[PDB]
Amino acid sequence: TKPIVFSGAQPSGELTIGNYMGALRQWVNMQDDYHCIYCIVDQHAITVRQDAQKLRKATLDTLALYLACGIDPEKSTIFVQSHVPEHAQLGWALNCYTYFGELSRMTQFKDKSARYAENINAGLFDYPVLMAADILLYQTNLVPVGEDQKQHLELSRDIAQRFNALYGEIFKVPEPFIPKSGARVMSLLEPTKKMSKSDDNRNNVIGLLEDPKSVVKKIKRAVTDSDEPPVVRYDVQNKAGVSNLLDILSAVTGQSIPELEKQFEGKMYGHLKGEVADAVSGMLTELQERYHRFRNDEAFLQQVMKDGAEKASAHASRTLKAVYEAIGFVAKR
Amino acid sequence: KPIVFSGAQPSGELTIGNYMGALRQWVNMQDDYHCIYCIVDQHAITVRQDAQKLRKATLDTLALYLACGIDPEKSTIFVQSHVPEHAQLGWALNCYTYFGELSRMTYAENINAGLFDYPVLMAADILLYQTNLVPVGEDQKQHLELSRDIAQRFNALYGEIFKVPEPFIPKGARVMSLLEPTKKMSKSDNRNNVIGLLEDPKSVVKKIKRAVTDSDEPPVVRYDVQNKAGVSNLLDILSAVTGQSIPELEKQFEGKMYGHLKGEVADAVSGMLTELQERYHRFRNDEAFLQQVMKDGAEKASAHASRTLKAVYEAIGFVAKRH
Ligand SMILES: Nc1ncnc2c1ncn2[C@@H]1O[C@H](COP(=O)(O)OC(=O)[C@@H](N)Cc2c[nH]c3ccccc23)[C@@H](O)[C@H]1O
Ligand SMILES: CC#CC(=O)N1CC[C@@H](n2c(=O)n(-c3ccc(Oc4ccccc4)cc3)c3c(N)ncnc32)C1
Ligand SMILES: O=c1[nH]c2cc(Cl)ccc2o1
């Protein structure tokens, strides 16, 4: 049997080129090499307060976006997290092998709490324990994520090791798969602030389902530097805007930074921004064409969800049964 | 008919204070209310324990509740972990519970997240069954109020999805500690202060013989909680078992010493525990019966739990499961 890949994306906000380059792109490429399981984590999404209609719609948007990106329901398991009770079940049990200190220190909790001060709920605190359960249920070997999720994974490895130490080899210990380019794509007007899918300012983001023409305009208006002469070079501390653009260019084309720097020799930010704009505009136009064919076919989405959940439940139930046996619960008949 | 929900923790040996003081009451109200008894193994794992002891103690708890007279045909009795809706609703309710409310209940970096988050599970356990009444002790009054606040908050956003649970106000027997007659007899205790429902006649005698009395000269068997705590407890225990009034017993032991009282108390108690113990060992040593009660209970629980969770999930706006 192949090693298992597991990842998730929240059905909240609007997925960006950041979400694509740091996660989805890898998801699509791993599908034959490994046994891949992709999850729409609607249970994680409600740690920030959602309009009920927005959540339902955004869950089906996320599904259609996965399919449009090239996730193949014939190769991978695609499912919605809340359709598999084993996630919440393992999550509770895994709370009892997770320390408060491990949860208090989490950066996402801190950053989330400050932004939604009027909704610092216990789910937001306990977010990482559900995310561990998500991963450990499927005997996962690899987890393809962006750099912002590194510490959440690390806790899951500690949990898995902690549990195994007491009870034997119930879990596999997962390992991160973070891309070489575009693991943390930066905001257009704030190149020191990560690109957010729920940013107040849309001018910071390249949205995957945004009008391409609006994206070319955002790229032209992206912040650069006062360098005289203007030079296209990777200098993150001194050239964050230009660099982030060069990295976007790299990961869309597959080209190297050294190659790009060479290609833009004797040229300025006009040549740069024109090239990033052509690359990304062509990608979004193709993706969006696929997206609409999928998103408007409810019967197809419904089938994918149904088959997905069945496959996941077969894996999930097997793992939970052994967890429950280990911890000493009377087994259900 | 009001829905009553009780959590019975698979651990802890039940005392005579539990049986004649609480359970015996509720056995006799199973036609008055739709009573639900949930063995809460998911709550138990907040404290690390031996897995095989937890499994055994779950079945020990079930057998004893059946032996105390909980009828699986009138009441719903089941194991918490057999109904996934508990953990499912638990997570969803985490997202409507302030972190502050969990920290407001009784260094801390070394406690497991279970010990911190379990009141949300308690809220879910109760709210799943549209519960009207929750019989709670004072240790768990703060927890019920959190359950009430959570239900109201959710309801105000989404409509009347939950019933707002109420405490069961009415309390009737006072069973106090044998060597500390001011403290109520509790399983959580010096086992010389308590009498377990599975204790033998010989152990009962030894514990009652040690029970504190007073230095009154001559010894006088009269009820007086302030001045004669030990003797008063012995009288209350005897009354609870036999149904004889205190005044009747005060006459029955006129001109008698505390040894006579102690001897009669031990006979009465051991007399009561015997038919309980008979049913217990008979139920406990019948796997298929226990397995059948558990199967039936969980099916009944899941039928009702599933309708609440489905309405909660629709309100929140999750895409419904296809299956
Ligand atoms: N600007 C950015 N540049 C590069 N990568 C980025 C950028 N912003 C986001 N990402 C990555 O995109 C994925 C989706 O993030 P979400 O917020 O939906 O989703 C999250 O943040 C997860 N908690 C969802 C989750 C829940 N359970 C799981 C189990 C395994 C893996 C993942 C999950 C992520 O991989 C994230 O790292
Ligand atoms: C603040 C304070 C206080 C206080 O004085 N104490 C003493 C007992 C301490 N404490 C619990 O009460 N529980 C617990 C166990 C089972 C349970 O089941 C139900 C479910 C629904 C309805 C009734 C009972 C509910 C709670 C604890 C736990 N799981 N894990 C640890 N401690 C638990 C709280
Ligand atoms: O990860 C988690 N935490 C949880 C807390 C409750 Cl009450 C239920 C399920 C959970 O899953």
Residue B245: how many other CB atoms lie within 10 Å = 10
Which residue has a Cα nearest atom 13 of ligand 1?
A19
**Residues on chain B touching A82 (C-beta within 8 angstroms):** 313, 318-319, 321
**Residues on chain A touching B116 (C-beta within 8 angstroms):** 100
Phi/psi for A292 (5° steps) reads -70, -35
Q: Do B298 and A332 touch (CB under 8 A)?
A: yes
State the burial class of residue B190 (Cβ atoms within 10 Å of its Cβ: 0-12, 13-18, 19+). exposed
Which residue bears the tokens 């894996």? A315
Query: Residue B224 carries which DSSP code?
Result: -
Tokens (6 digits) for A304: 């994918």
Q: Do B318 and A103 touch (CB under 8 A)?
A: no
Does residue A91 share a domain with residue A228? no
Contacts of A42 (CB under 8 A, 6+ apart): A10, A11, A55, A59, A80, A81, A82, B318, B319
Residue B58: how many other CB atoms lie within 10 Å = 26
Annotated binding-site residue? B10: yes
Give dist(CA A218, CA B232) in Å, integer: 84
Instruction: Report CA-CA distances (Å) from A328 to A205, B52, B53.
Output: 49, 6, 8
- Helices and strands, counts by H and E, chain A: 14, 5
Give dist(CA A312, CA A305) in Å, integer: 11
Q: In chain B, which among 70-129 make CB contacts under 8 A with chain A?
A: 79, 81-82, 84-85, 87-88, 90-92, 94-102, 108-117, 120-121
Tokens (6 digits) for A109: 């909790």
In this complex, which of B41, B88, B113 lies closest to A126 when CB atoms are compared? B113
**Residues on chain B touching A83 (C-beta within 8 angstroms):** 319, 321-323
Give dist(CA B117, CA B127) in Å, integer: 16
- Give the CA dihedral B301, B304, B305, B307, nearest 10 degrees: 160
Does residue B16 share a domain with residue B42? yes
Does residue B149 share a domain with residue B33? yes
What letter represents residue A99's amino acid?
A: Y
Does residue B299 share a domain with residue B186? no
Give dist(CA A91, CA A126) in Å, integer: 9
Does residue B144 share a domain with residue B102? yes
Query: Residue A267 carries which DSSP code?
Result: -
User: What is the resolution of the experimental data for this entry, in Å?
Assistant: 2.0
Give dist(CA A137, CA A149) in Å, integer: 18
> Coil, helix or strand for A30?
coil
Q: How far is A325 from chain B (nearest CA, A)?
A: 8
Give dist(CA A203, CA B213) in Å, integer: 82
State the burial class of residue B104 (Cβ atoms within 10 Å of its Cβ: 0-12, 13-18, 19+). exposed
Omega cis (within 30) before A258 = no
Instruction: Report CA-CA distances (Å) from B243 to B43, B204, B240.
Output: 36, 20, 6
Give dist(CA B32, CA B44) in Å, integer: 30
Reported as type and span, the H/E element at residue B242 is: helix B229-242
Which residue bears the tokens 């359709």? A83
Which residue has a Cα nearest atom 5 of ligand 2?
B139
In this complex, which of A55, A98, A330 lies closest to B317 when CB atoms are compared? A55
| Cα torsion angle, B175, B180, B186, B191, sign | negative
Does residue B129 share a domain with residue B37? yes
Contacts of B112 (CB under 8 A, 6+ apart): A95, A96, A97, A98, A99, A100, B46
Do A90 and A320 meet the contact criterion of CB atoms below 8 Å apart?
Answer: yes
Does residue A160 share a domain with residue A99? yes
Radius of gyration of chain B (CA): 22
Q: Which ligand is nearest to the CA of A43?
A: 1
Does residue A207 share a domain with residue A166? no
Residues facing A77 on adjacent strands? A37
Residue A158: how many other CB atoms lie within 10 Å = 16
Does residue A97 share a domain with residue A57? yes
Query: Residue B194 carries which DSSP code?
Result: -
Give dist(CA B162, CA A189) in Å, integer: 46
Give dist(CA B133, CA A44) in Å, integer: 32
Q: Which domain holds residue B235?
A: 175-286
Tokens (6 digits) for A27: 């998801």
How does strand B3-8 pair with strand B34-39?
Answer: parallel
Does residue A32 share a domain with residue A136? yes
- Beta strand segments in chain A, E: 4-9, 35-40, 77-80, 142-144, 175-177
Count interface pairs A-B at CB distance under 8 A. Answer: 165
Q: How many CA atoms lie within 13 A of A144 on its CB side?
A: 25
Give dist(CA B88, CA A90) in Å, integer: 10
| End-to-end alpha carbon distance in chain B | 34
User: Looking at the 3D structure of chain A, how many domains does it have?
Assistant: 2
What letter represents residue A274's amino acid?
A: G
Phi/psi for A265 (5° steps) reads -65, 130
Residues facing A324 on adjacent strands? none
Give dist(CA B313, CA B315) in Å, integer: 5
Do B302 and B81 meet the contact criterion of CB atoms below 8 Å apart?
Answer: no
| Residues closing a segment before a gap in chain A (C–N exceeding 2.5 Å) | none
Radius of gyration of chain A (CA): 21
> Coil, helix or strand for B314?
helix
Do A93 and B118 meet the contact criterion of CB atoms below 8 Å apart?
Answer: no
Length of chain B as a residue count: 323
Do B76 and B35 meet the contact criterion of CB atoms below 8 Å apart?
Answer: yes
Omega cis (within 30) before A174 = no
Closest to A35 (Cα-Cα) out of A312, A294, A318, A322: A312
- Residue A65 CA to its chain's centroid (Å): 12
- Residue A170 CA to its chain's centroid (Å): 26
Reported as type and span, the H/E element at residue A220 is: helix A212-220
Which residue bears the tokens 């070489």? A180
Query: Residue A20 carries which DSSP code?
Result: I
Specify whether the backbone of B97 is left (phi greater than 0), alpha (psi in -120 to 50) or beta: beta
Give dist(CA B39, CA A187) in Å, integer: 52
Which residue bears the tokens 């249920």? A137
Contacts of B154 (CB under 8 A, 6+ apart): B93, B96, B161, B162, B312, B315
Instruction: Report CA-CA distances (Å) from A325 to B13, B43, B122, B285.
Output: 23, 16, 23, 21
Which residue bears the tokens 């190149």? A191
* Closest alpha carbon within chain B to A167: B51
State the burial class of residue A162 (Cβ atoms within 10 Å of its Cβ: 0-12, 13-18, 19+). middle
Residue B118 Cβ contacting ligand 2 at under 6 Å: yes
Query: Could you give the angle at which helices A122-136 and A107-115 cross, rounded to 10 degrees?
Result: 140
Does residue B114 share a domain with residue B45? yes
Tokens (6 digits) for A206: 């390249």
Do B195 and B207 meet the contact criterion of CB atoms below 8 Å apart?
Answer: yes
Q: Does A327 touch chain B (CB under 8 A)?
A: yes
Give dist(CA B5, CA A126) in Å, integer: 27
| Cα torsion angle, B258, B262, B264, B269, sign | positive
- Helices and strands, counts by H and E, chain B: 13, 5
In this complex, which of B52, B59, B91 lies closest to A43 when CB atoms are compared? B91
Query: Which ranges of B2-140 would DSSP assign to H, the alpha helix?
Result: 16-18, 24-27, 41-44, 51-67, 85-94, 99-103, 113-127
Does residue A191 share a domain with residue A174? no
Give dist(CA B72, CA B296) in Å, integer: 8
> Coil, helix or strand for A62?
helix
Q: Determination technique for this PDB entry?
A: X-ray
Tokens (6 digits) for B290: 């226990």
